[PDB]
């Protein structure tokens, strides 16, 4: 169901006259939708990664892991 133009897709509910969805990204800022399972973003600025109180975080990667601490790293744990 392809579409094509210079600007792109649009949609706004006429009962609000607010653009509920657009694809001229420079104008309207994108927001995170609800109900998302995973997201694969090519660059992340994360303050903290944490799990929930049941299962284990797994920083797993087929590639190489390069963790660099500019002021230093501190590993705290029971069995390391």
């Amino acid at each position: 169901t392809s579409i094509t133009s210079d600007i792109g897709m649009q949609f706004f509910d006429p009962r609000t006259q607010n653009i509920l969805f657009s694809t001229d990204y420079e104008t309207h800022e994108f927001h995170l939708p609800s109900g998302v399972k995973s997201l694969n973003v090519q660059k992340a600025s994360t303050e903290r990664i944490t799990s929930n109180a049941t299962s284990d975080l797994n920083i797993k990667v087929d590639g190489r892991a390069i963790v660099r601490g500019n002021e230093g790293v501190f590993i705290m744990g029971k069995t390391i």
Partner: protein
């Protein structure tokens, strides 16, 4: 010099049929919702 229109008192159910007259992609513009059934969607720009 004129604008081609399409109107109805009801849904405009644009669809496509295969050789067996089975629906593959559909675009139903109804009164409340504008559904686009199919196997995909896309929005491209001119440059690709």
């Amino acid at each position: 010099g004129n604008a081609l229109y399409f109107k109805s008192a009801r849904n405009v159910t644009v669809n496509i049929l295969n050789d067996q007259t089975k629906v593959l992609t559909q675009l139903i513009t109804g009164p409340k919702a504008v559904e686009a059934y199919g196997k995909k969607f896309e929005v491209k720009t001119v440059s690709g």
